[PDB]
Design an enzyme around this catalytic site. Sequence first.
Site, PDB file in Angstrom:
ATOM      1  N   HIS A  61       0.846  -1.196   0.000  1.00  0.00           N
ATOM      2  CA  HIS A  61       0.000   0.000   0.000  1.00  0.00           C
ATOM      3  C   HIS A  61       0.884   1.249   0.000  1.00  0.00           C
ATOM      4  CE1 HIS A  61      -2.470  -3.078   2.340  1.00  0.00           C
ATOM      5  NE2 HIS A  61      -3.082  -2.952   1.176  1.00  0.00           N
ATOM      6  N   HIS A  91       5.313   6.889   6.852  1.00  0.00           N
ATOM      7  CA  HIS A  91       5.142   6.463   5.473  1.00  0.00           C
ATOM      8  C   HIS A  91       4.653   7.668   4.697  1.00  0.00           C
ATOM      9  CE1 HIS A  91       1.197   6.121   7.409  1.00  0.00           C
ATOM     10  NE2 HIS A  91       0.733   6.525   6.239  1.00  0.00           N
ATOM     11  N   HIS A  93       2.223   9.100   1.051  1.00  0.00           N
ATOM     12  CA  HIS A  93       1.160   8.870   0.084  1.00  0.00           C
ATOM     13  C   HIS A  93       1.604   9.815  -1.025  1.00  0.00           C
ATOM     14  CE1 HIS A  93      -1.601   6.854   2.907  1.00  0.00           C
ATOM     15  NE2 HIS A  93      -1.033   7.652   3.794  1.00  0.00           N
ATOM     16  N   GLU A 103      -3.164  13.579   0.817  1.00  0.00           N
ATOM     17  CA  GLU A 103      -4.473  13.131   1.258  1.00  0.00           C
ATOM     18  C   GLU A 103      -5.238  14.345   1.750  1.00  0.00           C
ATOM     19  OE1 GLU A 103      -3.631   9.500   3.755  1.00  0.00           O
ATOM     20  OE2 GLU A 103      -4.466   8.654   1.907  1.00  0.00           O
ATOM     21  N   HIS A 116       3.370  10.919   6.707  1.00  0.00           N
ATOM     22  CA  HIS A 116       2.611  10.623   7.918  1.00  0.00           C
ATOM     23  C   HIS A 116       3.484   9.956   8.968  1.00  0.00           C
ATOM     24  CE1 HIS A 116      -1.492  10.548   5.619  1.00  0.00           C
ATOM     25  NE2 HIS A 116      -1.119  11.769   5.954  1.00  0.00           N
ATOM     26  N   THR A 195      -6.391   6.799   7.298  1.00  0.00           N
ATOM     27  CA  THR A 195      -6.843   7.070   5.937  1.00  0.00           C
ATOM     28  C   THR A 195      -6.892   5.832   5.048  1.00  0.00           C
ATOM     29  OG1 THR A 195      -4.637   7.628   5.111  1.00  0.00           O
ATOM     30  CG2 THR A 195      -5.971   9.416   6.052  1.00  0.00           C
TER      31      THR A 195
HETATM   32  N1  LIG Z   1      -2.510   6.951   6.656  1.00  0.00           N
HETATM   33  S1  LIG Z   1      -2.597   6.943   8.259  1.00  0.00           S
HETATM   34  O1  LIG Z   1      -3.919   7.401   8.626  1.00  0.00           O
HETATM   35  O2  LIG Z   1      -1.459   7.648   8.793  1.00  0.00           O
HETATM   36  C1  LIG Z   1      -2.459   5.246   8.792  1.00  0.00           C
HETATM   37  C2  LIG Z   1      -3.215   4.268   8.115  1.00  0.00           C
HETATM   38  C3  LIG Z   1      -3.111   2.968   8.524  1.00  0.00           C
HETATM   39  C4  LIG Z   1      -2.272   2.571   9.602  1.00  0.00           C
HETATM   40  C5  LIG Z   1      -2.178   1.097  10.031  1.00  0.00           C
HETATM   41  C6  LIG Z   1      -3.296   0.224   9.465  1.00  0.00           C
HETATM   42  N2  LIG Z   1      -3.281  -1.101  10.033  1.00  0.00           N
HETATM   43  C7  LIG Z   1      -3.516  -1.381  11.301  1.00  0.00           C
HETATM   44  S2  LIG Z   1      -4.595  -0.491  12.245  1.00  0.00           S
HETATM   45  N3  LIG Z   1      -2.818  -2.447  11.768  1.00  0.00           N
HETATM   46  C8  LIG Z   1      -2.709  -3.132  13.010  1.00  0.00           C
HETATM   47  C9  LIG Z   1      -3.567  -2.807  14.080  1.00  0.00           C
HETATM   48  C10 LIG Z   1      -3.466  -3.485  15.304  1.00  0.00           C
HETATM   49  C11 LIG Z   1      -2.489  -4.519  15.484  1.00  0.00           C
HETATM   50  C12 LIG Z   1      -2.464  -5.204  16.862  1.00  0.00           C
HETATM   51  C13 LIG Z   1      -3.507  -6.142  17.253  1.00  0.00           C
HETATM   52  C14 LIG Z   1      -4.657  -6.532  16.446  1.00  0.00           C
HETATM   53  C15 LIG Z   1      -5.605  -7.430  16.902  1.00  0.00           C
HETATM   54  C16 LIG Z   1      -5.517  -8.040  18.212  1.00  0.00           C
HETATM   55  O3  LIG Z   1      -6.442  -8.895  18.610  1.00  0.00           O
HETATM   56  C17 LIG Z   1      -4.392  -7.675  19.032  1.00  0.00           C
HETATM   57  C18 LIG Z   1      -3.445  -6.768  18.564  1.00  0.00           C
HETATM   58  O4  LIG Z   1      -2.397  -6.479  19.423  1.00  0.00           O
HETATM   59  C19 LIG Z   1      -1.389  -5.588  19.074  1.00  0.00           C
HETATM   60  C20 LIG Z   1      -0.392  -5.380  20.021  1.00  0.00           C
HETATM   61  C21 LIG Z   1       0.690  -4.473  19.737  1.00  0.00           C
HETATM   62  O5  LIG Z   1       1.628  -4.256  20.581  1.00  0.00           O
HETATM   63  C22 LIG Z   1       0.707  -3.786  18.437  1.00  0.00           C
HETATM   64  C23 LIG Z   1      -0.287  -4.005  17.517  1.00  0.00           C
HETATM   65  C24 LIG Z   1      -1.402  -4.930  17.777  1.00  0.00           C
HETATM   66  C25 LIG Z   1      -1.601  -4.852  14.384  1.00  0.00           C
HETATM   67  C26 LIG Z   1      -0.518  -5.932  14.468  1.00  0.00           C
HETATM   68  O6  LIG Z   1      -0.867  -7.083  14.837  1.00  0.00           O
HETATM   69  O7  LIG Z   1       0.658  -5.616  14.174  1.00  0.00           O
HETATM   70  C27 LIG Z   1      -1.742  -4.143  13.175  1.00  0.00           C
HETATM   71  C28 LIG Z   1      -1.523   3.577  10.267  1.00  0.00           C
HETATM   72  C29 LIG Z   1      -1.600   4.903   9.884  1.00  0.00           C
HETATM   73 ZN   LIG Z   2      -0.873   7.670   5.829  1.00  0.00          ZN
END
Ligand SMILES: NS(=O)(=O)c1ccc(CCNC(=S)Nc2ccc(-c3c4ccc(=O)cc-4oc4cc(O)ccc34)c(C(=O)O)c2)cc1
Ligand SMILES: [Zn+2]
Length: 257
Positions: A61, A91, A93, A103, A116, A195
């Site tokens: 992405h 990152h 965009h 954005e 961002h 976003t």
């Molecule tokens: N453009 S922007 O707005 O700046 C932007 C857009 C997207 C993102 C990130 C999008 N994705 C996400 S939200 N990913 C995510 C969310 C939560 C966890 C997560 C999850 C999830 C489910 C759960 O059941 C338990 C989780 O535990 C976690 C413990 C941690 O220490 C860190 C992350 C984390 C994880 C992961 O596993 O790395 C990834 C950041 C900025």
């Molecule tokens: Zn972003």
Amino acid sequence: HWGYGKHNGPEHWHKDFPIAKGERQSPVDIDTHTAKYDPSLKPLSVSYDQATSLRILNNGHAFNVEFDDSQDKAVLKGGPLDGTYRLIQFHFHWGSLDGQGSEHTVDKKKYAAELHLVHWNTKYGDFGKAVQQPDGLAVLGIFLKVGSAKPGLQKVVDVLDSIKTKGKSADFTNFDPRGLLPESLDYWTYPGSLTTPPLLECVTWIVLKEPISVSSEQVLKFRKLNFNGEGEPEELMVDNWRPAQPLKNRQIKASFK
Ligand SMILES: NS(=O)(=O)c1ccc(CCNC(=S)Nc2ccc(-c3c4ccc(=O)cc-4oc4cc(O)ccc34)c(C(=O)O)c2)cc1
Ligand SMILES: [Zn+2]
């Protein structure tokens, strides 16, 4: 899954991520004449002196420069923020052309790209818990315009060839994010969301007014990346931005008069 193509782009996201039509979605157009100076805003504090970058990854992405956030190293405080927010990654965009890519927009103006810097509120323990809170995240947004080269960005530009496709990563230690900041920290702030899917509404947005200048050569290299994985039909990673979303009665505040 979701992407930025005609068949899986921003206009399709709502089908799998209904919050796409939410009341606090990002990005938004920043109408400078409607934004109001807010005296209640405390000084913004960007403390990246102890930042520990570790790796750069093409996630299909965009590309993320990840940091070690197991400790209070690089943090963002002050401004509209309550408490301490830890830098986890940054990152960009960008567009396929200089006239688009950002954005957020300013008085409808689209910049060539947007940086961002993502931070999570430390009182929630981890990033996962943070994305379940209305004040779990803080993203510092910086606009990029095409002009003179940005010295501090070149190291990022030169490693892109090693992570051309989705899933590829490369060691990226000792990178100083302070080299990507403009001189002024004047900013606009409002409550928003991520976003990209999952489009969670847990973000306090802080968008800097002053854009940084990057060279045409530098942005051209951003456009050589691929959305696809290795061995698949080449889809240039360009126009990975979401257009402005409805403001919905929210108010954008300015840190400057
Ligand atoms: N453009 S922007 O707005 O700046 C932007 C857009 C997207 C993102 C990130 C999008 N994705 C996400 S939200 N990913 C995510 C969310 C939560 C966890 C997560 C999850 C999830 C489910 C759960 O059941 C338990 C989780 O535990 C976690 C413990 C941690 O220490 C860190 C992350 C984390 C994880 C992961 O596993 O790395 C990834 C950041 C900025
Ligand atoms: Zn972003």
